[PDB]
Amino acid sequence: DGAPPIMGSSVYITVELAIAVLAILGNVLVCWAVWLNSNLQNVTNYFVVSLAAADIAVGVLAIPFAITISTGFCAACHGCLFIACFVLVLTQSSIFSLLAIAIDRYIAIRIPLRYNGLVTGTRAKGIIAICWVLSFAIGLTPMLGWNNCGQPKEGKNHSQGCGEGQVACLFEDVVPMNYMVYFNFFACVLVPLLLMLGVYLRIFLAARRQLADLEDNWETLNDNLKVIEKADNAAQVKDALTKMRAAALDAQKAPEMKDFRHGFDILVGQIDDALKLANEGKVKEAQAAAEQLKTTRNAYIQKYLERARSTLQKEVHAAKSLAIIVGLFALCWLPLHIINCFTFFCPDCSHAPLWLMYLAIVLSHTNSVVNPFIYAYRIREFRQTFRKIIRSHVL
Numbered sequence: 092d093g094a095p096p097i098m099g100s101s102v103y104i105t106v107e108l109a110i111a112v113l114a115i116l117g118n119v120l121v122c123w124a125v126w127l128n129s130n131l132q133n134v135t136n137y138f139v140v141s142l143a144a145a146d147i148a149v150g151v152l153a154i155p156f157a158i159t160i161s162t163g164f165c166a167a168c169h170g171c172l173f174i175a176c177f178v179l180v181l182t183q184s185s186i187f188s189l190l191a192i193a194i195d196r197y198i199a200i201r202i203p204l205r206y207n208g209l210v211t212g213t214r215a216k217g218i219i220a221i222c223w224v225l226s227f228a229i230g231l232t233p234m235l236g237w238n239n240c241g242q243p244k245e246g247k248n249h250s251q252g253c254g255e256g257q258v259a260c261l262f263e264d265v266v267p268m269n270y271m272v273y274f275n276f277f278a279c280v281l282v283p284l285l286l287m288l289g290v291y292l293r294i295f296l297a298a299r300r301q302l303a304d305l306e307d308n309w310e311t312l313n314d315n316l317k318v319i320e321k322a323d324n325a326a327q328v329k330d331a332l333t334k335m336r337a338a339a340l341d342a343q344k345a346p347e348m349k350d351f352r353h354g355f356d357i358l359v360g361q362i363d364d365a366l367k368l369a370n371e372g373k374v375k376e377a378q379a380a381a382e383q384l385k386t387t388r389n390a391y392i393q394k395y396l397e398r399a400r401s402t403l404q405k406e407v408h409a410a411k412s413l414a415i416i417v418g419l420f421a422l423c424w425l426p427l428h429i430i431n432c433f434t435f436f437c438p439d440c441s442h443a444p445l446w447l448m449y450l451a452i453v454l455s456h457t458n459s460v461v462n463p464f465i466y467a468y469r470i471r472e473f474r475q476t477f478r479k480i481i482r483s484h485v486l
């Protein structure tokens with residue numbers, strides 16, 4: 092007896108098809124938006140588009156393949172392997188795109204002046220092509236001989252009635268678990284995820300150190316103004332102006348930049364005017380001259396400190412958005428990997444039940460639906476472009 096298998100299969104297939112439709116629709120929308128809007132055509136979003144292409148291919152190809160292999164149909168073993176492993180190509184391509192995005196944002200916050208000369212569209216396109224080639228080689232490695240085709244399940248193959256040279260096409264009968272655990276999970280998934288975690292950690296540390304340095308230079312300017320006003324001797328005035336001058340040149344280092352220089356030029360020239368007074372022992376004139384710095388601070392320096400701060404806060408917010416993507420990739424794929432570790436490392440354990448295997452498979456596929464929602468909720472330029480596309484070409 093036992094419940095007819097087609098009842099549970101019907102539920103699984105219906106859910107897979109629902110996921111495939113949403114993965115295609117949302118990720119086509121991502122690609123459309125980048126095509127339409129020049130503000131979205133930058134190197135970072137070339138990797139976003141490559142990631143969306145991989146998720147479109149989950150809906151078009153990997154989900155029909157997953158449905159097919161759930162039936163255990165008879166197949167030539169290398170044809171079976173291709174249908175079993177193709178999803179691993181798409182998932183490896185996703186990992187490479189996620190890693191490139193993290194490195195791109197790290198270069199941008201670490202050496203922003205070098206960024207545009209280093210990271211070009213032409214170089215990004217070459218990197219994307221190479222990553223797709225490597226993804227095929229990695230995900231299809233079982234087809235090169237690391238497979239169980241040489242040790243068929245003869246009982247399964249006779250009970251299904253397969254012909255000569257065919258196997259019953261079931262994932263765990265043809266793909267070796269040592270490949271899935273040691274090669275795919277540990278080396279190809281978990282090591283890159285840990286690398287991505289460390290890169291994001293370095294991004295947030297760099298932003299936090301730059302904001303701290305901004306504030307230090309700002310407090311150094313103001314505190315030394317108070318010292319000069321509180322002073323009663325040329326050397327104390329002289330000392331405070333010298334410290335004020337270094338903070339000013341440090342801040343200057345940390346079209347639009349023409350007004351920026353004029354502000355700091357008035358500032359540094361005023362410090363030098365006051366210093367020259369100080370070296371001659373004119374303390375009250377040095378204090379008077381040093382009081383002019385306050386209108387320069389209010390007219391130029393505070394305004395540029397604010398823009399620097401808000402630019403850094405935007406980069407932090409944008410890096411947090413992109414890291415949520417990495418975290419949802421991990422949440423959707425880790426259950427399947429962890430089940431494989433139990434299967435492989437605990438021969439004394441009963442195998443995870445079939446309903447749980449298929450739930451983990453469906454969860455991994457749902458990852459191909461979620462990124463368009465994160466872009467819509469977290470990134471204004473995507474949200475506004477989505478809204479324009481839907482209102483114009485669907486309404």
Ligand SMILES: CC(C)CCC[C@@H](C)[C@H]1CC[C@H]2[C@@H]3CC=C4C[C@@H](O)CC[C@]4(C)[C@H]3CC[C@]12C
Nearest residue numbers: 151152165166167168169170171172173174257
């Ligand atoms: C969408 C288009 C462009 C690409 C799709 C190509 C797919 C559908 C083709 C390419 C290779 C094909 C497989 C190659 C060999 C076999 C072994 C045979 O015993 C069963 C069919 C099977 C498993 C084929 C199924 C269909 C297949 C997966």
Ligand SMILES: CC(C)CCC[C@@H](C)[C@H]1CC[C@H]2[C@@H]3CC=C4C[C@@H](O)CC[C@]4(C)[C@H]3CC[C@]12C
Nearest residue numbers: 421422425426427429430433440441442443444
């Ligand atoms: C990243 C987070 C969400 C991972 C979620 C943890 C999941 C994948 C873990 C938690 C408890 C685990 C199960 C607990 C014990 C068993 C019984 C054993 O005979 C087969 C594996 C099986 C069935 C485990 C499968 C994996 C499992 C379900």
Ligand SMILES: CC(C)CCC[C@@H](C)[C@H]1CC[C@H]2[C@@H]3CC=C4C[C@@H](O)CC[C@]4(C)[C@H]3CC[C@]12C
Nearest residue numbers: 281425428429430432433434435436437438440
């Ligand atoms: C979450 C990331 C960062 C680390 C990944 C944790 C993985 C590798 C850990 C978490 C829980 C672990 C499992 C917990 C218990 C068992 C049963 C034991 O008889 C064999 C090892 C096995 C099956 C472990 C394998 C490794 C394991 C799956």
Ligand SMILES: Nc1nc(NCCc2ccc(O)cc2)nc2nc(-c3ccco3)nn12
Nearest residue numbers: 179261262263271427428431445448449452
């Ligand atoms: N273990 C596993 N099984 C399957 N499908 C087979 C589910 C199953 C397992 C046992 C059985 O007797 C009948 C069916 N797909 C799978 N995909 C993956 C995978 C992809 C990426 C990481 O793990 N692991 N994986």
Ligand SMILES: CCCCCCCC/C=C\CCCCCCCC(=O)O
Nearest residue numbers: 169220223224227228231232234235
């Ligand atoms: C964007 C461009 C993507 C094109 C990449 C294609 C390159 C494929 C490279 C290596 C794939 C190796 C898989 C081996 C095929 C086995 C065939 C067989 O033995 O039947």
Ligand code: NA
Nearest residue numbers: 145146185459
């Ligand atoms: Na993906």
